[PDB]
Design a binder for this molecule. Sequence first.
Ligand SMILES: [Br-]
Lengths: 113, 99, 278, 115, 9
Amino acid sequence: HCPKEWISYSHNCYFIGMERKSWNDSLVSCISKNCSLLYIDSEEEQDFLQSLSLISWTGILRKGRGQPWVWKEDSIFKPKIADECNCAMMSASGLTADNCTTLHPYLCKCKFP
Amino acid sequence: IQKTPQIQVYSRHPPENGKPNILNCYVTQFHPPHIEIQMLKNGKKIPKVEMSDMSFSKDWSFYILAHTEFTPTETDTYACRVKHDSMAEPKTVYWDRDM
Amino acid sequence: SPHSLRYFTTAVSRPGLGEPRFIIVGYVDDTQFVRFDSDAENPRMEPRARWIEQEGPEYWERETWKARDMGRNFRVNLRTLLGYYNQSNDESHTLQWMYGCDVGPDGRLLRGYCQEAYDGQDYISLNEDLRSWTANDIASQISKHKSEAVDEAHQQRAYLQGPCVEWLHRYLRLGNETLQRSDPPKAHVTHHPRSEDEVTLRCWALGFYPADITLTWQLNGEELTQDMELVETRPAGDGTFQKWAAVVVPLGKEQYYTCHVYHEGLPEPLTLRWEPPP
Amino acid sequence: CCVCLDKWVGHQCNCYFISKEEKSWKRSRDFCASQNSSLLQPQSRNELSFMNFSQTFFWIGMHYSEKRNAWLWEDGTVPSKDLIRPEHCIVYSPSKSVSAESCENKNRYICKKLP
Amino acid sequence: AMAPRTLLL
Ligand SMILES: [Br-]
């Protein structure tokens, strides 16, 4: 049971942030609402998220130039990510690297009990 | 603002009197894209004229290649008639084996 | 050495003759490979190169689908633009969109494009940084503001750096034997008596691939002094190109004039002269 | 509650099915009918507010009444904005665009679950 | 392949 103004897909709640924030602030804003910055589990979910046709900060991030992209909890889905562009964003063309400091919208996955 | 089409009428292969060939009409540097291209045999229109897909250059002006099956002869006069918004009268360019 | 994937889209409005004509033409390295025309018997993405036929119905379906949405949106965009410029519906108006990839021998993006023109004039274009747009007037400033609200620049940059680059690589290997082929020019010299004391010597270069060529005339083994007539390179319509260079020479001076053909499909350049029958 | 079946999207206590597949208008409304739903009737301005950025066109529950000689919703209701040929069927973009097209043309669709 | 989006003017 998600709030009326939000999106409900596969027992998870989704909402867009009111503002365009940096990667960190976008991660911080989701946590503050008992949700998490968008994470991808399946292609069916990714394709549904591409249907919304929005720019969204994704949870997937890298520590540096040679450091690998980090995501956990044994979910094999790791899509193709297209400098200081060390953070991954979701678009209509799939996952794309971008500068964490640049302001982009963000989507939170809540998953109510 | 309109751009006046530039025309080139020529054969695909070196012409030989009696030997069948392809006649080309290369129309370029024009705007707006609405254009009428007629290929002629002794002043009369040719029905089966194949058009290339309407594309444009980076200066936004359109270009198109019209073509028809023809047979070069010393007697027959071949041409390309072009009707475009930029010209009050149609532009006719004759085919010259020499160019 | 440089490689490119580009799409040229055109929506040209009809004065009561139904809906506007919608065209998309795809080019890989300056040669057409796919086309969509709303005026064709059954509008769909059609192959315009033999090597793209290697794509399964899954590819064609996806592209026919993208094109049908594009046309609808370009039609709506034409109706928005008419209202912006307070134009009569009874006239032919045109909206153009060019976008694509520029890669070097290094398989990475050199530059990305995403620009539009309304009635032959620039409207809105994506900057080299691929983060901001350039408007040209009030109407385009409204369209820039609309694009900003839906983060269009970021969306286009995503495509330009990702799928556009990746697909270009797939196309480059798919039609390598054609794209990077070398058709040598077949050169000959025609004689045309221009005046009572003058002659036109026309040096032809036919059936060559790629289109890049250098045709030059030399008087007694030295570069042109007079004005040289030359046609703009033209397609033969079979995949190859044609071009000619001409010179107005005095009568009896034909042999003291030599033509030089410079094309990558030739191991050594071609040296040509007018060959008179005995 | 206000939850939806697998692959469906819930918003404002309404269950929507956004198609991946292209189908004719008749077959699309026939698919919606079987899932005890119907094609979307976006008489409300921003029905698909969550889909607002989408440029994609989907079939909607609109039918031309040859007797009343005007456009009508599957409901029987009469719309008022964004509109022409009676023989054509309507596609709607969540970005509020509306386009007429052949009913035998294949297109994506949106089913809205009935109560 | 083509871009999934165009500019909505
Ligand atoms: Br928030």
